Design a protein around this nucleic acid. Structure first.
Ligand SMILES: Nc1ncnc2c1ncn2[C@@H]1O[C@H](COP(=O)(O)OP(=O)(O)OP(O)(O)=S)[C@@H](O)[C@H]1O
Ligand SMILES: Nc1ncnc2c1ncn2[C@@H]1O[C@H](COP(=O)(O)OP(=O)(O)OP(O)(O)=S)[C@@H](O)[C@H]1O
Ligand SMILES: Nc1ncnc2c1ncn2[C@@H]1O[C@H](COP(=O)(O)OP(=O)(O)OP(O)(O)=S)[C@@H](O)[C@H]1O
Ligand SMILES: Nc1ncnc2c1ncn2[C@@H]1O[C@H](COP(=O)(O)OP(=O)(O)OP(O)(O)=S)[C@@H](O)[C@H]1O
Ligand SMILES: Nc1nc2c(ncn2[C@@H]2O[C@H](COP(=O)(O)OP(=O)(O)O)[C@@H](O)[C@H]2O)c(=O)[nH]1
Ligand SMILES: [Mg+2]
Ligand SMILES: [Mg+2]
Ligand SMILES: [Mg+2]
Ligand SMILES: [Mg+2]
Lengths: 98, 170, 335, 354, 315, 327
DNA sequence: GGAAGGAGCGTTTTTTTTTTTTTTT
């Protein structure tokens, strides 16, 4: 298990918000975790190569949308997440993040 | 936790479960192989699973290697006498700067140096992936090159092959 | 005129339109009215050699689309093409999924141009069972834009699911009763002068195959033209060309069989095989001679019918003609 | 020099000396070769079928059809098993024997022949205006030995590209030819020469070679020993003439193929002894015969008729022998390894005799 | 939603597995002791091999199950590279476990493993046996190469008896509160042919269709095993009886000719009553009919002729 | 669009209510979906009995009109090797539903064409992801399915279509078209169908074509036989009577005349004669043995071609010799 | 001076289509 953490600065991570699954109410202290197969997640690498900005949006139904902006070429990638996270993976993720 | 076949493994050549005549033949052949100019360079043991091929080879090496190794001229890796009587090829080893098919080729290229004050018995039990056609062809080439080598000095090379049928697979 | 005379008569007189197809009206009517209904189903043509299956499908395709549109709406594959499972799963499927090409104004004006393509699998009985299985859902799914036509001589070689999917058309054998008009027309076109009943004899010899009959007529016409005597072709010449054994030789064989002496039969058969007669023709002639004879009893006829069937089945397996013929004659002599 | 089989081979239809009716039919075919159909010549081996085909081609094109050369064509299977085929060619025709490819013969039909059929042969006209077109002639030797798949592949190639190609197939028996292929062909029966015509040809060869012949009867005997195979007749005539200082006599032995003598010895052994050990020795002889690439079905024919030639055997024995021969011939046709069926035949004969 | 009963009622402890009482008891002894050796578990489908191995691993490893078990089956990559890297790294891992406890590598459907991977497994077993133990699960123990078998204890699971199947069915019925009759449970057990998975599936199907598990209701959905019908057809003393069975019970029920002939061969192989000559002749006739069917002539007439020949031989 | 389709496809059932003949299976599956407890399914049966139609209709009912978004359908026309099972099927079965619409459905049509290795790999995919996904396997030949796969599926047998269901579907088609079918024609169609709806629909379409004016012309048994080129029952009866009573010459002439009248093929005559003789009351059983063996041999020989006249004479002789036992 | 037990012998190896693994890429 390895981790890549994005800095909490307004230069790489412009903004982050957690909406409690309704897009409206902001909740602090709640962690949203999305589990994906790298075979599908890695398909956005080439789109990110030319990307200027990337907007991630995850819903409660297990759908992740990535909007990539490079007058210009615009890309939208939608992927489904896995059904559930195994106990070992959940424990390792919690240990890594805490 | 200990398995009995490991806990009660033979501690000497006499305790090895092997027919006397076969043991005598193997011992004579191996002893001849250790002589300065030995006619035979490779000893190929074949048989079914668990018939004491590797065990008898190791027990015999424990006696033969000390008796035929030249005393080091005050040179050795570590303080200990480097009890490495048997050098075995490891088929699952993967290194960064070597293609898989060449791994065995590298091993032999080192094994040739284990003579005289560095004498050691070369044992091949875990073979390379001979089910791959190219790997098998390269293995055969290397064996032939060892057999036809012009090197004046080489260490004894023992190949233990356990014969078994391959069940039909989908 | 030389260019028109560059083709054997079978290719020269291949039907151009569905009207030219003879003796197969039971299916030709359905195919013809499909031109107006535009409701063509998947088809399975099956029948013995030289009955007009390939000609019928080619005429239908020509009538439906026309010389130009056809090239974009037809995919033809036969035994001369590789037709493995991968081919069925890639090339046939891709063609079946292809969008229907846009017809030109001329095509629409002149031809019905139904909104689907056609995949013809000639000699379909040569395809493997797995390759055939790969066609099932391809035919079912893309039936809106694609229709399949399978053609074969041995229907049992088509797997049951495909036979169920396809509407079946049996092509009947062409004999002296239903195909005589076409052969007479061909003879009149080529100015072949033959004695009365010659065309009947050709059609009876051909045994359901009009292609063989047309080839025989061409050979007889060539012989007559080379002779250049101006005389009518005779049935004896036709029988000689067809390889039919002369009646006197058959009578000699029958007398030898009646005698029953093994050595004499062996000697006569050894001398008879010198001439190179085909054992199949001899067996057919012996069946005709014995089954229709009124001088033998019922048990004899039953036994000889089974013997003849066994010998013919063995010959169909590409067996060795001398041995089979001698065995058959020895068995008959023992009846 | 060349063997007498090829040295005195006729090179035109007018040079044919036996089966006059066949020559007349071939000449009638050559009258207007513009619409020549596909041909299938069938008859006993060594009678002159290939010679007649070459004479027909010479009549259509000219003597240049005899200026033959050889090329090697490479094919690759789906398993990457590279292999080669010999293609004989004259400026007007091609000759192939796909059966030499075994089960791969179909590939030859699917790749080579089709391509030849697809490439339309055109040439600049020497005097007239525009290109001139001419169909290609292709000879398929040993047609009866083709697999059913190759025969099926031949069908639409023969039909569709009839303008560019005309096939002339040659076989010794039509039993293995599938019905569609026969339907697509003009069948030509080629009878074997009679003993008198074989003797006449041999006498002409003898006179040309200046070999002293005591009596013509010898030639007749040679004919009777060839069983109508003219090629074999000429080969034995040459062998006997060379072995007797170019002087044949009534006492001069007739030289037969060695495997034929071996089969005769095997027949005598089978007749004399019928036991398990005899069967094992018969197996040894059969394997020796097979090691020389003698076809299994040919061995079965020759053994069967050699056995039927035995004088001591009675009618029941011969009837049983021919029954077993037919059964095991079918088994060989439908089988994979011929040794099983040859052994079964010999064992059944031993049982019936004993 | 609601899980199918086959997965809903999968035993979670070794004490809930029925049948093979001796083997299950030995597994319980191993679980309580700890000294688990390399083992191979062989048997027919749906008798509890996978459940037994999973339950034993859980009981042995307790909370350490997540970090102490490596499970791989035919649905995962299991080539030689996997043995070289993943299994090797797992076996090299140093995990602190209670005394007598080792890491477990579960190789379900081990029979399908490739020859190269199996040969590679020898060295890892030799090197890491002090900390890792291997549990193979398969249907044919002979499909594991002999050098691997030489290191493992063999355990063959037998077919479940009607008593064990009935006991488990009664437990499931009590949990689900299902209405039934003795004849219905008898029919379910008879149609299961010793497969507990099939018994549970058929019980669930019958309950969903009608709720009350009777004989008639069970037989409306479930069909009697066609091997028994084929055996009855083959053993009929009259040609007409065999033909009638073939027509009514097999042909008109939609059974394909190929299935009928394959089942006939399988059944004839196990006919204890018949003599050897008759048996081998019947096998020959079945093979000839199978050859005819494979060529495309899969007609009822061919099967009737096969039956006629078999009857002729019986006389 | 649907008007241009072949009838076998134009009349494909859309809802489960349109599937006839399989009352038990339809009842059970409908109740399962009503309770939402669908297990892994196996549909085993002969061609053209409604398996694919039933599974598609069930998917439509479960997911409404948007079933194509959460159903993964694969058939023999698609490659389904072990790699496909490991990657595509595995990823589909291991991912969430589009809108949390319960479980996902994977249809493996014609699964008897899948390799043993792929079927073996399917076992644990089916088992582990049962909570989120359900599998449906359709087949005509069970011997091609591994025992492990068969153990995992709830089995449903599609019987050959009964006469009543075929009659109801024929009535529906006749109403949809402007067609008139006679009772004798319906009986002939049912007899020749052998429980396959596809054959019924194809023959009906061909019969509609045969009619000169379908708006007013009625289909009779003669039209059915003309379209199928099949023998009439009277022809079979006459041939059998001549074989069993007339002498060899008369029987040969009768067979030749009957065949030449409408160009009948020998195989269909043999099949009809076998149907007739199956109901014959024979006092000697050896007669049945001879009949069955000889006629099966003749059918096998015909399957490879051969000489037609010799085969017909063989049929005559075989029947005569077999019935000499009853003497 | 009877077996009882044991070892050694009795051997060589492409091919149709189709699917799959492995290694280098
Ligand atoms: N008296 C003994 N004699 C031989 N091996 C013994 C003995 N006692 C315990 N063992 C163990 O049994 C095993 C013997 O098997 P092996 O020597 O490996 O036979 P093998 O011929 O090399 O078969 P493979 O190729 O390893 S499966 C060794 O692990 C030994 O430690
Ligand atoms: N019904 C027919 N009407 C007119 N000519 C026919 C007919 N059938 C065959 N022929 C003639 O014989 C030739 C071959 O006809 P085909 O349509 O190729 O027969 P076929 O049934 O396709 O033969 P197979 O099955 O490939 S052996 C045609 O070019 C025609 O000259
Ligand atoms: N002995 C058993 N006791 C209770 N339930 C069983 C038993 N055997 C099978 N089952 C039931 O059927 C389901 C499958 O059991 P499994 O252990 O997977 O059978 P299996 O022998 O491993 O089948 P294979 O070899 O993987 S096809 C379990 O979840 C149980 O619900
Ligand atoms: N029970 C049925 N009710 C109504 N029509 C049916 C029925 N079964 C088959 N058909 C008709 O025949 C056509 C084919 O039905 P299918 O469901 O595809 O048969 P099938 O059992 O799946 O055939 P196989 O096993 O794939 S060859 C349908 O479009 C329907 O028009
Ligand atoms: N003088 C003469 N020789 C012939 C004649 N026909 C064939 N031959 C010769 O006899 C041999 C016949 O063998 P071949 O042509 O291969 O016949 P095939 O095997 O049936 O094709 C050849 O060497 C010919 O040269 C003929 O009509 N006259
Ligand atoms: Mg060892
Ligand atoms: Mg054709
Ligand atoms: Mg399991
Ligand atoms: Mg279907």
């Amino acid at each position: 298990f390895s981790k890549i953490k994005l800095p909490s600065n307004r230069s790489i991570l412009e903004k982050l918000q957690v909406f409690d699954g309704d897009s409206t109410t902001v909740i602090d202290g709640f962690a949203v975790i999305g589990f994906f197969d790298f075979t599908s997640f890695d398909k956005i690498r080439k789109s990110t190569k030319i990307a200027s900005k990337v907007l991630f949006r995850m819903d409660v139904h297990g759908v992740l949308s990535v909007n990539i902006l490079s007058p210009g070429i615009v890309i939208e990638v939608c992927m489904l997440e896995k059904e559930s996270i195994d106990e070992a993976a959940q424990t390792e993720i919690e240990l890594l993040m805490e | 936790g200990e398995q009995w076949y490991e806990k009660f493994k033979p501690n000497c050549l006499e305790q090895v479960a092997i027919h006397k005549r076969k043991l005598k033949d193997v011992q004579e052949a191996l002893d001849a192989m250790f002589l300065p100019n030995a006619k035979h360079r490779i000893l190929l043991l074949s048989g079914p699973s668990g018939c004491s091929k590797s065990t008898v080879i190791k027990e015999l090496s424990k006696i033969l290697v000390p008796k035929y190794r030249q005393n080091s001229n005050g040179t050795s890796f570590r303080s200990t006498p480097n009890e490495h009587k048997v050098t075995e090829f490891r088929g699952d080893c993967i290194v960064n700067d070597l293609p898989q098919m060449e791994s065995f080729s590298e091993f032999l290229k080192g094994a040739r140096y284990l003579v005289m004050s560095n004498l050691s018995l070369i044992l091949i039990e875990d073979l390379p992936n001979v089910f791959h056609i190219d790997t098998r062809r390269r293995f055969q080439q290397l064996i032939l090159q060892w057999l036809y080598s012009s090197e004046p000095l080489l260490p004894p090379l023992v190949i233990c092959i356990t014969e078994c049928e391959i069940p039909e697979n989908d | 005129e030389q260019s028109l005379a560059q083709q054997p008569w079978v290719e020269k007189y291949r039907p151009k339109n569905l009207d030219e197809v003879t003796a197969q009206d039971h299916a030709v009517t359905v195919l013809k009215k499909t031109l107006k209904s535009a409701n063509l189903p998947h088809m399975l043509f099956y029948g013995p050699p030289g009955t007009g299956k390939t000609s019928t499908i080619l005429a239908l395709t020509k009538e439906l689309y026309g010389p130009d549109l056809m090239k974009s709406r037809i995919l033809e594959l036969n035994a001369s093409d590789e037709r493995g499972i991968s081919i069925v799963r890639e090339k046939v499927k891709n063609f079946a999924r292809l969008t229907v090409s846009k017809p030109s104004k001329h095509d629409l004006e002149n031809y019905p141009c139904p909104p689907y393509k056609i995949i013809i699998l000639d000699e379909a009985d040569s395809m493997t069972a797995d390759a055939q299985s790969a066609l099932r859902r391809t035919m079912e799914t893309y039936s809106g834009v694609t229709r399949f036509c399978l053609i074969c001589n041995y229907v049992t070689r088509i797997i049951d699911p495909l036979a169920s999917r396809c509407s079946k058309f049996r092509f009947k054998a062409l004999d002296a009763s239903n195909a005589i008009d076409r052969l007479r027309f061909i003879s009149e076109q080529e100015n072949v002068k033959c004695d009365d009943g010659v065309l009947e004899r050709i059609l009876d010899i051909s045994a359901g195959d009009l292609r063989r009959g047309i080839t025989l007529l061409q050979s007889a016409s060539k012989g007559a033209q080379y002779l250049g005597d101006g005389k009518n072709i005779t049935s004896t010449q036709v029988e000689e060309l067809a390889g039919v054994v002369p009646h006197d030789i058959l009578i000699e064989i029958v007398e030898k069989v009646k005698s029953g002496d093994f050595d004499e039969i062996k000697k006569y058969v050894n001398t008879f095989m010198k001439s190179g007669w085909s054992a199949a023709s001899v067996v057919n002639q012996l069946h005709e001679y014995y089954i229709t004879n009124d001088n033998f009893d019922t048990n004899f006829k039953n036994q000889i019918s089974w013997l003849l069937f066994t010998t013919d089945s063995r010959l169909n397996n590409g067996t060795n003609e001398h041995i089979q013929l001698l065995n058959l004659l020895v068995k008959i002599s023992q009846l | 020099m060349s063997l007498w089989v090829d040295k005195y081979r006729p090179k035109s239809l007018n040079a044919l000396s036996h089966n006059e009716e066949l020559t007349n039919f071939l000449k009638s075919l050559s009258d207007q070769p513009r619409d020549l159909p596909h041909l299938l010549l069938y008859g006993p081996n060594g009678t002159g079928k290939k010679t007649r085909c070459m004479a027909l081609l010479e009549s259509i094109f000219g003597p240049g059809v005899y200026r033959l050369k050889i090329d090697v064509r490479q094919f690759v299977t789906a398993s990457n098993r590279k292999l080669e085929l010999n293609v004989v060619s004259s400026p007007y025709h091609l000759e192939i024997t796909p059966s030499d490819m075994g089960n791969n013969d179909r590939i030859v039909i699917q790749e080579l022949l089709k391509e030849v059929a697809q490439m339309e042969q055109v040439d600049f006209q020497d005097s007239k205006d525009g290109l001139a077109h001419r169909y290609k002639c292709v000879i398929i030797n040993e047609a009866n030995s083709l697999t059913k798949d190759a025969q099926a592949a031949l069908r639409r190639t023969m039909e569709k590209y009839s303008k560019n190609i005309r096939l002339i197939m040659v076989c010794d028996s039509m039993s293995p030819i599938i019905a569609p292929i026969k339907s697509r062909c003009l069948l030509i029966r080629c009878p074997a020469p009679s003993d008198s015509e074989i003797s006449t040809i041999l006498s002409d060869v003898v006179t040309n070679e200046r070999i002293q012949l005591e009596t013509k009867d010898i030639l007749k005997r040679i004919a009777q020993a060839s069983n109508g195979n003219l090629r074999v007749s000429l080969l034995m005539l040459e062998s006997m003439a060379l072995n007797n200082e170019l002087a044949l006599k009534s006492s001069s032995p007739i030289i037969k193929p060695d495997w034929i003598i071996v089969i005769h010895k095997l027949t005598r052994k089978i007749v004399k002894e019928r036991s398990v050990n005899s069967l094992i020795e018969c197996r040894a002889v059969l394997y020796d015969l097979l090691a020389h690439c003698i076809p299994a079905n040919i061995i079965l024919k020759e053994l069967t008729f050699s056995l039927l030639d035995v004088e001591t055997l009675n009618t029941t024995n011969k009837s049983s022998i021919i029954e077993y021969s037919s059964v095991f011939d079918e088994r060989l046709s439908l089988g994979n390894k011929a040794i099983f069926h040859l052994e079964g035949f010999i064992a059944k004969v031993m049982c019936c005799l004993d | 939603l609601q899980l199918p009963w086959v997965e809903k009622y999968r035993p979670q402890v070794l004490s809930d597995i029925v049948g093979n009482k001796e083997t299950i008891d030995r597994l319980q002894q191993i679980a309580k002791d700890g000294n688990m050796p390399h083992m191979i578990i062989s048997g027919m489908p749906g008798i509890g091999k996978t459940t037994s191995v999973h339950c034993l691993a859980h009981e042995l490893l307790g909370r350490s199950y997540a970090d102490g078990v490596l499970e791989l089956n035919a649905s995962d990559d299991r080539g030689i590279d996997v043995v070289r890297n993943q299994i090797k790294h797992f076996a090299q891992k140093k995990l602190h476990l209670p005394p007598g406890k080792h890491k477990i590598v579960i190789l379900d459907e081990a029979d399908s493993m490739t020859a190269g991977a199996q040969q590679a497994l020898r060295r890892t077993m030799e090197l890491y046996s002090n900390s890792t133990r291997f549990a193979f699960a398969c249907n044919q123990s002979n499909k594991i190469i002999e050098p691997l078998q030489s290191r493992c204890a063999i355990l063959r699971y037998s077919k479940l008896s009607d008593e064990d199947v009935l006991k488990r069915l009664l437990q499931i019925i009590k949990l689900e509160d299902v209405k039934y009759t003795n004849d219905g449970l008898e029919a379910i057990i008879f149609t299961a042919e010793g497969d507990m998975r099939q018994a549970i599936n058929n019980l669930q199907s019958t309950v969903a269709g009608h709720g009350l598990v009777n004989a008639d209701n069970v037989f409306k959905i479930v069909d009697s095993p066609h091997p028994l019908i084929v055996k009855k057809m083959l053993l009929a003393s009259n040609l007409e009886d065999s033909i009638q069975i073939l027509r009514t019970d097999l042909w008109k029920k939609g059974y394909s000719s190929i299935d009928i002939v394959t089942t006939s061969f399988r059944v004839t192989k196990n006919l204890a009553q018949v003599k050897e000559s008759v048996r081998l002749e019947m096998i020959k006739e079945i093979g000839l009919t199978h050859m005819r069917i494979l060529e495309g002539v899969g007609t009822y007439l061919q099967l009737a002729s096969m039956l006629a020949k078999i009857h002729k031989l019986n006389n | 669009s649907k008007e241009n389709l072949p009838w076998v496809e134009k009349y494909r059932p859309e809802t489960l209510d349109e599937v006839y003949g399989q009352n038990e299976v339809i009842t059970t599956v409908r109740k399962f979906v009503d309770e939402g407890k669908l297990p892994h399914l196996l549909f085993y049966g002969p061609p053209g009995t409604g398996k694919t139609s039933t599974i598609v209709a069930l998917a439509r009912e479960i997911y409404g009109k948007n079933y194509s978004n959460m159903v993964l359908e694969l058939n023999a026309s698609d490659d389904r090797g072990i790699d496909v099972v490991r990657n595509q099927i595995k990823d589909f079965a291991s991912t969430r539903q589009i809108f949390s619409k319960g479980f996902k459905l994977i249809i493996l049509d014609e699964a008897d064409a899948m390799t043993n290795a792929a079927q073996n790999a399917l076992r644990r995919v089916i088992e582990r992801y049962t909570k989120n996904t359900r599998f449906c396997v359709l087949a005509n030949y069970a011997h091609k399915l591994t025992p492990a796969l068969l153990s995992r599926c709830t089995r449903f047998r599609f019987q050959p279509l009964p006469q009543e269901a075929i009659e109801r579907r024929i009535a529906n088609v006749l109403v949809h078209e402007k067609l008139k079918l006679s009772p004798n024609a319906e009986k002939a169609l049912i007899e020749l169908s052998n429980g396959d709806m596809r054959r019924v629909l194809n023959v009906l379409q061909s019969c509609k074509a045969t009619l000169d004016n379908p708006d007013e012309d009625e289909i009779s048994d003669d039209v059915i036989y003309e379209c199928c080129g099949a023998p009439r029952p009277s022809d079979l009866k006459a041939v059998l009577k001549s074989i069993l009573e007339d002498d060899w010459g008369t029987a040969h002439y009768t067979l030749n005349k009957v065949r030449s009248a409408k160009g009948l093929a020998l195989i269909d005559l043999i099949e009809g004669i076998v149907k007739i003789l199956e109901d014959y009351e024979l006092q000697n059983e050896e007669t049945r043995v001879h009949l069955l063996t000889k006629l099966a041999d003749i059918e096998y020989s015909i399957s490879k071609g051969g000489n037609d006249q010799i085969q017909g004479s063989a049929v005559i002789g075989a029947i005569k010799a077999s019935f000499e036992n009853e003497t």
